[PDB]
Ligand binder design. Structure first.
Ligand code: SAM
Ligand code: SAM
Lengths: 215, 205
């Protein structure tokens, strides 16, 4: 049985470096936009693309007990947790974090992370986190902040314990298109991409229809 | 419910329906129309960037912070007599909209300064009647305008509404939505691309 931590490091390496899945998904999303445009249902939209990935990806791991991903090569990880188990993990309630443009590092007040940089992370990781959230409204809030935190074409890694088609509609409704789904032992591993255009992903969701993340 | 009505509209204005981009088109149509009549020329037109997935909402008169539950809404809740702990204490009339700052600056537990052009939405839900003077009612509405980003919306729930449109248009706010709910009147006013455009519309209206 393979680890979710290895599965995620493997995809992030394929998506940005070894296989360039960020470029394959870009070419597709551009094709869907041309198609929608030619059916008259979308038209002009804003498109933002990612530059060549850096040699060190900025990864945000929210709900990290330990820092599983810190040692991975080419991953500069910022680890946040409500009840950290290791000292390298920052204390934070993600639900109470502001996504601030114009900054780069977490800003802490009274030991807790209160502010994170917007459009800064090539990857945000929610490994077995959303299930703790009290309501479905707060699960979608976590995903919405992640979207604000991701760079264009960045990826949100979502690992849930043992509706996905709703999680796919609900996330495309906010600008996140799924790019991978695999069933590992006792867990479902997903990746959602920050599409080149939110309007495009939102349109895909409209055609493919609950607007929250339930359990 | 007025809280469900507002959350629904804000989502349609910024995300689901793009009313902010439709009302932009409507206002650039009206400006080029004035310009054709020589009643307005080149003018300062300010547009909004693509709204974040988490919007900055200011709830003035927030008694218990009902909007902090909306997923799209990061709410900074103010109230002269907070009924909940998540709500900051403040007398909006004694608060200054300050350009440069980025967060609310408090003094002795009361909010005294707020960031200008920082919020996509400001909410006056049944507040402007608990204000004494009609010049303080406008002061609230004038600080909302300064707190709002280009093309942001001011939600206004009320317990003449034509003279209300004109008075708010004179300060740069043109209405975009109106619906009657049980016992209240729900309104939304947008910060037009140009204040001079909005003021022009009010003079003609
Ligand atoms: C699945 S477990 C531990 C992480 C797991 N080893 C993984 O693969 O990421 C749940 C984690 O989510 C954290 N958590 C729950 N709510 C949180 C919140 N509001 N902000 C940050 N972390 C939170 C818990 O503290 C806990 O560390
Ligand atoms: C009828 S309540 C509206 C509360 C909430 N918006 C709602 O939907 O029920 C009037 C609110 O405006 C507040 N208020 C009155 N004057 C204020 C002022 N000068 N600054 C801030 N809040 C004020 C009151 O404390 C009260 O919470």
């Amino acid at each position: 049985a393979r680890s979710r931590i290895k599965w995620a490091i493997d995809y992030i390496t394929k998506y940005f470096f070894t296989e360039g899945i960020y470029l394959q998904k870009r070419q597709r999303e551009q094709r869907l936009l041309e198609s929608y445009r030619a059916e008259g249902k979308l038209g002009e939209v804003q498109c933002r693309l990612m530059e060549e990935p850096p040699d060190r990806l900025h990864v945000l791991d929210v709900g990290s007990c330990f820092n599983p991903f810190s040692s991975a090569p080419h991953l500069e990880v910022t680890a946040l947790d409500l009840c950290p188990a290791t000292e390298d993990v920052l204390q934070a309630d993600f639900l109470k974090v502001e996504v601030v443009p114009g900054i780069r590092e977490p800003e802490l007040e009274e030991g807790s992370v209160r502010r994170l940089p917007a459009s800064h992370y090539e990857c945000v990781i929610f490994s077995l986190l959303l299930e703790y959230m009290p309501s479905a409204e707060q699960r979608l809030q976590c995903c919405l902040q992640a979207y604000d935190l991701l760079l264009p074409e960045g990826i949100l890694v979502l690992i849930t314990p043992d509706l996905m088609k709703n999680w796919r509609y609900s996330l495309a409704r906010i600008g996140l298109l799924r790019v991978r789904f695999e069933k590992l032992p006792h867990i479902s591993c997903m990746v959602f991409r920050k599409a080149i255009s939110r309007e495009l992903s939102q349109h895909w969701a409209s055609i493919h229809r609950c607007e929250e993340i339930r359990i």
